[PDB]
Design a protein around this ligand. Structure first.
Ligand code: ANP
Ligand code: ANP
Ligand code: MG
Ligand code: MG
Lengths: 636, 417
DNA sequence: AAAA
DNA sequence: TTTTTTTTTTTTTTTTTTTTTTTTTT
């Protein structure tokens, strides 16, 4: 019974008319037909006959198949609060398949709307009777929502061929005050008024009675005065303010950029939902606002920039396993959802790869997705109570952050460490704003010249850490016979970073590596194997762990008090002339290699034996042919 | 037109003066209208009523058509001359005023005038006062009586805040429920400790005055902490539960200053947690005592007048090392509880040690974002709260756990040099 | 001259 | 140690209009 809905709903007929416009050639196959069915099913749940009407065409597939699968799809879309496709796609398809013949329908439609108003109110046009017409014309290029501060904001969908910034096609852009809408009202809407005027003139020409001619003359005279108010500034402001309500789409800001599988690139929007990555450079409906200005091309090793970057990167670090691991870790920066609670921390003598690769990745990802942070977020204590901290309000939605400065050797803290690497949550304040808690997801790295000071032994601080050090050195005096020395090129920094082409090549490298990791190790960065790492890191762990050094250097029962005093004096003698109030030493004493010497004195004291307190000196992999990026074999 | 509008819809809008002194608009949502996710059958705050504007311009217009046709009708019938002249003048004057309802300034004036009629005194401070009502994704949940009843129709309870977690009756046969129960039993083996720690976490849904008590348990690392704690917060939503900052405990007393936003959390909340430390810290034995006593406390927000509020929220804090406490008074050390984890998750679970299990790097990176597991966990919590209420009459202290009040009193036997 |  | 200053209110909210508008039309 589509006829009743046609009677009741004009939009239903209009939408059906749109279906009438585009060919059924794409309706024939299941994918596109299911797409349009889902789209119209998103618009209310009573349009079922319309698609059902659309179903009898080519009834051979409809019956025995299409007929029952249509209601199946309708039921499925009924309970799928999921990605939404709406009528905008149908209008775009109609504009594509049948251009210049569908429009006359739309001008007829909103001409009818305007004529209905002008007849109903004798040519006295006010606000909100132009807002409806404007919303009818451009309802697929503007969306209004309310942000936290309570202000209304305007977003518009850009299209090719209009003035715009660099590389923001097919994406929404925030606008403080809609210019394009004002020019549209002033210029494009004026054409419809001409249609109304000529229609009035036409019906005035035809012979009729006296009273009807008088009525038409009065209507024309009244409408003429109202015809020129669309150019008034205050009237346009009123129209915009009224139209703000019609355009509103609730739950738009809070769903903006929420999908972590979509990236905004310079030539469209990039999707890494499936393998391989698919580049969208046409109409779509995903709510993507932020972007990076780097165009994307498929990864091709034949590009000269690609070869140069690969060769230079291989020159940066020789070891194959370390190279693959550090590239896999960096490739996860493009992802923005929950990641592994891991952190990289590598330092070098100087003129190496530090403060270089991080920068390159930083520029490639753009300020929207990556940014540099401040080391005071680590080597400083927490701010007192609720003093606002705008520095911490970086990395809010950022996918990558890096550090490059240190002052000699200093502490690292652990509270901040266990705060900025966990896949949990975090809360903070910036300035003149209320307290806010935001999910944090970003790969982090730190570059320095000296080691960091760590004072702990638990997993909660050592699980999340990795360590590396450079094995090359760039200088103008490349002494031969030393492979750990290369002639520096003072051109990778002062230029070769500002060049867009190398940035595109590097982005291709990164996306290729992310695809490789996803399809090989199922996204588990810990699952990959690297002998140099998790050995050098645990060697660093074999330092910074003075308890074992004290045990191997200075170690009757002597009870327990001697141990903390011996540790403190050993600290003064070998480490620092200061105490460490290590009353807790007992628990990690028995957690250390002391169980065999552990004793339990009758005077309710569990103590140690074998306390030979030494005071002064009394004693007792493979290499590839020419393609390392080729991922190597399965063990790799 | 304000009187007419108030006649039309006076049952879907309420106006009250907020703290700052500016009128605000609330409206009651109904199924089948444009709306956010999971806020049905509840009042939603509205900065500027747009629905009222569109209603004024569209639905109220039909009445004007009735007036116009009535005028035409009484003009049709034969009468005197003067009466017809009067009716003509009336019709023309009304027609001149018929289009004013579409003007923006006129609508703004109408709304401003209607602000006085719609006002319902004492509406803000009576909002969300009842602790027995919970706003859920598919309505509002009542825990006044056992069993808990779900309201998904018309009512008059002034409920504004909510959580976006749909509620279903507790069915152990659901795969998510069984998986959560199994993982939870794996988290802590002891039956008594598991029951006690679940009873403590069950009271978080309550928002009235609770028993003064604090939970504080540490782990070696890679333990269930920050999994179930964050799970509870995710289930409850930021409206009812949110993370805190350890500076409210480790730092000194908050100086007079003027504002305090970090402490302005846990006002109207029912649950908060800390999961960050370093080495060890002192708790001052104060600035927490009033955060656990069932009394009120005073502080202020940004550029806002001084205010006080009640302290009603279950607390918990995690770390890796022990905490530093220096006191022996019966007043303190009595409203504290301590647990120590006995398990550990790793990729290499060496056998012969029951205190060791294979890690599953999937409970965290997902299994929290999935709505259905959150629904199952909410069902678990409501079932446990019902059990506690019907067994121990709502007294968390009356329940018995040999593992607790033994390890905690052993801690009391420490820290007493 | 009063009304639009 | 320095605790307070930095942040804060703000801060624009009357102008916009409205009305008229004489002239025009009756
Ligand atoms: N693979 C390479 N081949 C040749 N020159 C290179 C290569 N990588 C980097 N360089 C050059 O070496 C320099 C790198 O400096 P840089 O990496 O910033 O030093 P660093 O590692 O940060 N130590 P420092 O800058 O003192 O903290 C620049 O002049 C680069 O052009
Ligand atoms: N049955 C289980 N229940 C819970 N977690 C499990 C289970 N089996 C394995 N796990 C692992 O436990 C992890 C959750 O604990 P997690 O929060 O990572 O430890 P943590 O204590 O918070 N780290 P830390 O804060 O430094 O001590 C998951 O990521 C899994 O890898
Ligand atoms: Mg460098
Ligand atoms: Mg944990």
């Amino acid at each position: 019974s589509l006829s009743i809905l046609m009677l009741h709903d004009p939009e239903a007929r209009y939408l059906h008319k749109i279906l009438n416009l585009l060919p059924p050639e794409y309706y024939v196959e299941y994918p596109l037909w299911s797409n349009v069915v889902f789209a119209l099913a998103n618009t209310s749940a009573n349009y079922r006959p319309l698609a059902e009407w659309f179903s009898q065409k080519c009834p051979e597939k409809w019956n025995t198949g299409g007929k029952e699968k249509l209601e199946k799809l309708w039921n499925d879309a009924s309970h799928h609060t999921e990605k939404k496709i709406t009528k905008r796609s149908i209008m775009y398809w109609a504009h594509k398949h049948a251009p210049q013949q569908y429009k006359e329908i739309v001008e007829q439609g909103y001409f009818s709307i305007l004529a209905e108003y002008v007849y109903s109110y004798n040519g006295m046009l006010e606000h909100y009777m132009i807002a409806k017409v404007i919303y009818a014309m451009m309802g697929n290029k503007f969306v209004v929502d309310v942000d936290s501060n309570g202000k209304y904001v305007w977003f518009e969908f850009v299209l090719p061929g209009q003035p715009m910034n660099q590389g923001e096609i097919w994406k929404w852009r925030k606008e403080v005050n809609p210019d394009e809408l004002h020019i549209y009202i002033s210029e494009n809407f004026s054409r419809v008024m001409d249609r109304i005027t000529e229609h009035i003139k036409y019906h005035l020409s035809q012979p009729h009675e006296s009273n009807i001619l008088n009525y038409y003359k009065k209507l024309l005279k009244a409408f003429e005065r109202s015809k020129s108010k669309i150019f008034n500034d205050s009237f346009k402001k009123g129209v915009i303010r009224q139209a703000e309500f019609l355009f509103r789409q609730r739950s738009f800001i809070q769903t903006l950029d929420t999908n972590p599988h979509l990236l905004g690139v310079g030539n469209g929007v990039l999707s890494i939902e499936t393998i391989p990555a698919k580049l969208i450079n046409h109409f779509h409906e995903h709510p993507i606002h932020q972007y990076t200005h780097i165009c994307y091309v498929p990864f091709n090793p034949e590009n000269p920039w690609t070869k140069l970057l690969l060769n230079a990167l291989q020159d940066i670090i020789p070891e194959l396993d370390a190279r693959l691991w550090i590239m896999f870790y960096l490739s996860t920066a493009i992802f923005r959802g929950l990641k592994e609670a891991l952190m990289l921390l590598w330092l070098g003598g100087g003129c190496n790869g530090k403060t270089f690769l991080m920068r390159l990745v930083a520029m490639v990802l753009g300020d929207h997705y990556a940014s540099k942070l401040n080391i005071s977020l680590l080597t400083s204590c927490r701010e007192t109570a609720e003093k606002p901290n705008s520095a911490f309000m970086r990395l809010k939605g950022r996918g990558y952050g890096y550090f490059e400065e240190t002052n000699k050797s200093e502490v690292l803290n652990t509270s901040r460490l266990k705060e900025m690497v966990n896949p949990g949550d975090v809360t903070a304040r910036e300035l003149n704003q209320k307290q806010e808690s935001f999910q944090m997801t970003a790969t982090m790295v730190a570059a320095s010249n000296y080691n960091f000071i760590i004072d702990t032994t638990d997993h909660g601080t050592w699980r999340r850490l990795r360590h590396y050090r450079s094995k090359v050195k760039f200088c103008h005096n490349p002494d031969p016979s030393n492979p750990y020395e290369k002639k520096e090129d003072p051109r990778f920094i002062h230029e070769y970073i500002m060049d867009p082409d190398c940035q595109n090549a590097f982005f291709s490298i990164l996306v290729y590596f992310w695809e490789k990791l996803q399809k090989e190790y199922n996204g588990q960065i810990k699952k990959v194997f690297c002998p140099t790492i998790e050995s050098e890191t645990e060697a660093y762990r074999k330092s910074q762990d003075t308890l074992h050094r004290f045990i191997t250097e200075r170690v009757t029962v002597y009870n327990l008090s001697e141990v903390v005093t011996a540790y403190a004096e050993w600290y003064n003698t070998n480490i620092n002339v200061k105490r460490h109030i290590a009353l807790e030493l007992s628990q990690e004493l028995e957690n250390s290699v002391l169980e065999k010497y552990l004793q339990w004195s009758p005077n309710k004291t569990r103590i140690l034996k074998g306390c030979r307190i030494l005071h002064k000196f009394e004693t007792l992999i493979c290499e590839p042919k020419n393609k390392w990026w080729e991922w190597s074999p399965n063990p790799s």
